């Protein structure tokens, strides 16, 4: 109940190659074309992607910025607080980004910050304003 190995035969194809007197060469010609069709459409996207590749030449290496490595600190300078509030305003809840910006505050320290200062920096109000965008 199995063809010899690598021989392929399903009920449906058998019927398909037989029904017409030339149904064979019809079906085999369709695929011949349907192939050359895909073979060409490969050539398109090759050449399309070849030009896109040319535009990226240079990479982004000229626009690379040096690595900042600030060591997390417990204190908040008055400066640091001000950056926070502007960051909150610009970033909302992306605490990662806020921490990245201040330069040397952990993402937890950032979160606490909302709670400890929220009171006085109307971080409620601030945050609605970011929402309105």
């Amino acid at each position: 109940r199995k063809p010899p190995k690598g021989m392929f035969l399903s009920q449906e194809d058998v019927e398909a190659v037989s029904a017409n007197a030339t149904a064979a060469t019809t079906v085999l010609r369709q695929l011949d074309m349907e192939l050359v069709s895909v073979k060409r459409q490969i050539q398109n996207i090759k050449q399309t992607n070849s030009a896109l590749k040319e535009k990226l030449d240079g990479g982004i290496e000229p626009y690379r910025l040096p690595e900042v490595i600030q060591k997390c600190n417990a204190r908040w300078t008055t400066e640091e607080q001000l950056l926070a509030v502007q960051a909150i305003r610009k970033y909302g809840r992306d605490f990662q980004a806020i921490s990245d910006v201040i330069g040397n505050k952990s993402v937890v320290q950032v979160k606490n910050f909302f709670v400890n200062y929220r009171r006085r920096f109307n971080i409620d109000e601030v945050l609605q304003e970011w929402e309105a965008e």
Binding site: S18, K55, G59, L82
Partner: protein, 666 residues
């Protein structure tokens, strides 16, 4: 096997079971208790063994009983019935033997046998063996019929049968002991030689053979599993199924390439999409650098919004560089994934032109074996006789097969040059009307209780008739004759003064440049003692080549062998013969094959004897008077010698059962 059991096997019989036939004559026993059956079986097998262990002298009832030892020795009728039964149906005491018991003084019954082909001869002997009067009529000036052999000087080569297809259960094995046949194994190595003259590389030779064998099992799958057996009301042929299977493989190659390249695009497109993301990211990065540059040019000390604007742009920029570097990674992978897919492409083709020409050879070979275009073979039934294959290797008859029929014709009333033109059968008896082949007018009349027809199938099919039946044959017979296949295959015999080929190699192929031409001279044999090369025409070729001068045909051969063996190594031939079996009017072809739309059943139809109507109306049902034998009557051994002779033995037993009666059935 060996023992008694091996005698059964060697006589084509199941050692541990009673056959249908035996049941017919020993109905007491087989319906009887199990014990008795084992006795019977043993007796038979032992008796068989005895005949076999020495087939050069008659095995008598007495001799047989002497060698039995009770409990089997005890019942002497059972031994007698069993012996006489085997005696009757040529299982023992057939062929050429010395006779212990000289013959019945006078002869009972008269039979005319048409054709001195092995089937005919084997019957004749058998009947005369039983004490009937027999006379054979042969249109030819020689016995054997399709056992033709060529002789001239010490050149010897069959144009007819040549091969014994294994001795394992072949009754010709027994004849081989009774007659000196120089039996040589055939070294099955056969190297193929393309059109140009060049051996095919071992590597390919195997690729194609395997694919050929693979394609065949394939067809059998279609037939027996997918039931692919009729197309538009007409029954499927092997040829058709092979094409379909082949196409389907061609088609599957394409389907694979499509799927592969299509998997390439879908990844190519993934790259396209990615690069866009990457270009637009670089564009937003570009500007965002400038912004950061401008902002950091506001020299400090600065107000905190301006400080924020530096910091924020700085981070917003590293954020994008992060994204872009991950997409450069993702790109790296996809650029390699296309190295992979470009590197491993599915096969370009199913078969090259070269491949398909070599494959055409392997098909020609099948058209050789079955002596017909695969166009014509029944898909379902062409290989039905494959279960009854003998064991052991195939052997040629080195001294010429004609040695066998001749040997059988010793002591037989054979009228050569006597062509039958009409067979008359009636409840009273039969008149056969023949003539002289030499002067058509010299007319003969023969009267007999029964006629046995061994006329070849090609003759029976001949339209308008070469032989008239009176009354005509019933439709059930004539329809079977129409449905059955009668193929063709010719031999060219090349006689030389020196062996200019490798003697180590018995046979070797040639590969025709066409599909339409694969049969033409596709195979060559040196199997004989002398320097004789034999060349075969098979397939659709055979029937067309019958309209070409021998000179030309030998031309086309010589050409081939020059190309293969070197233009100067090929001496012209001293002696040449070409067969034309379809042309031959006492043959009209080579041998039967199961045409599409026929079955193995037709072989049985062909064997069924014919009973005339009564003479006076309301007179009792008459005995049957017209019998048939020959290669086309034996369902399990068609188109061979053993089949012919087996049919011969069979009819002889049947006729005797009719006209001498069978007192062993009680």
């Amino acid at each position: 096997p060996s023992g008694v059991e091996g005698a059964a096997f060697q006589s084509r019989l199941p050692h541990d079971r009673m056959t249908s036939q035996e049941a017919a004559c020993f109905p007491d026993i087989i319906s009887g208790p199990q014990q008795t059956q084992k006795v019977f079986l043993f007796i038979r097998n032992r008796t068989l063994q005895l005949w076999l262990d020495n087939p050069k002298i008659q095995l008598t009832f007495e001799a047989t009983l002497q060698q039995l030892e009770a409990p089997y020795n005890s019942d002497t009728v059972l031994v007698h019935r069993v012996h006489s039964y085997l005696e009757r149906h040529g299982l023992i005491n057939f062929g050429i033997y010395k006779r212990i018991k000289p013959l019945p003084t006078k002869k009972t019954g008269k039979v005319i046998i048409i054709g001195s082909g092995v089937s005919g001869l084997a019957a004749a002997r058998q009947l005369q063996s039983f004490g009937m009067d027999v006379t054979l009529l042969e249109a030819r000036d020689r016995v054997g019929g399709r056992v033709a052999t060529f002789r001239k000087g010490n050149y010897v080569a069959d144009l007819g049968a040549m091969v014994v297809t294994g001795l394992g259960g072949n009754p010709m094995a027994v004849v081989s002991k009774q007659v000196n046949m120089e039996l040589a194994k055939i070294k099955q190595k056969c190297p193929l030689y393309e059109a140009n003259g060049q051996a095919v590389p071992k590597e390919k030779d195997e690729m194609v053979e395997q694919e050929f064998n693979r394609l065949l099992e394939a067809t059998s799958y279609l037939s027996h599993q997918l039931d692919f057996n009729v197309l538009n009301n007409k029954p499927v042929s092997l040829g058709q199924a092979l094409e379909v299977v082949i196409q389907l493989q061609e088609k599957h190659v394409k389907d694979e390439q499509i799927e592969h390249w299509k998997k390439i695009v879908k990844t190519q497109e993934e790259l396209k999409e990615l690069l866009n993301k990457m270009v637009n990211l670089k564009e937003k990065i570009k500007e965002l650098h400038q912004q950061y540059k401008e902002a950091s040019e506001v020299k400090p000390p600065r107000d905190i919004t301006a400080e924020f604007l530096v910091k924020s742009k700085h981070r917003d920029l590293t954020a994008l560089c992060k994204e872009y570097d991950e997409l450069a990674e993702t790109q790296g992978k996809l650029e390699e994934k296309l190295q992979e897919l470009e590197a491993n492409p599915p096969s370009d083709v199913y078969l090259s032109s070269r491949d398909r020409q070599i494959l055409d050879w392997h098909f020609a070979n099948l058209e050789f074996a079955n002596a017909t275009p695969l166009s014509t073979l029944s898909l379902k039934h062409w290989d039905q006789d494959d279960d009854f294959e003998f064991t052991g290797s195939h052997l040629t008859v080195r001294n010429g097969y004609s040695c066998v029929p001749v040997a059988l014709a010793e002591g037989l009333d054979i009228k050569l040059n006597t062509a039958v033109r009409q067979v008359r059968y009636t409840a009273s008896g039969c008149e056969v009307i023949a003539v002289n082949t030499r002067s058509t007018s010299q007319t003969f009349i023969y009267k007999c209780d029964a006629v046995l027809c061994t006329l070849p199938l090609g003759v029976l099919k001949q339209q308008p008739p070469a032989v008239q039946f009176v009354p005509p044959l019933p439709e059930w017979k004539t329809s079977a004759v129409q449905r059955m296949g009668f193929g063709n295959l010719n031999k060219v015999v090349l006689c030389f003064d020196r062996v200019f080929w490798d003697p180590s190699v018995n046979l070797f192929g040639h590969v025709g440049s066409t599909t339409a031409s694969r049969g033409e001279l596709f195979l060559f044999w040196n199997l004989y003692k002398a320097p004789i090369l034999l060349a075969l025409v098979a397939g659709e070729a055979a029937g067309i080549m019958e309209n070409i001068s021998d000179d030309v045909i030998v031309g086309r051969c010589l050409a081939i062998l020059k190309g293969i063996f070197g233009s100067s190594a090929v001496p012209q031939p001293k002696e040449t013969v070409v067969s034309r079996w379809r042309a031959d009017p006492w043959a009209r072809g080579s041998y039967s094959y199961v045409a599409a739309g026929s079955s193995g059943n037709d072989y049985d139809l062909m064997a069924q004897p014919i009973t005339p109507g009564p003479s006076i109306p309301g007179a009792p049902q008459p005995i049957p008077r017209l019998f048939f034998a020959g290669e086309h009557t034996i369902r399990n051994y068609p188109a061979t010698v053993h089949g012919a002779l087996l049919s011969g033995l069979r009819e002889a037993g049947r006729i005797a059962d009719q006209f001498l009666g069978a007192m062993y059935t009680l």
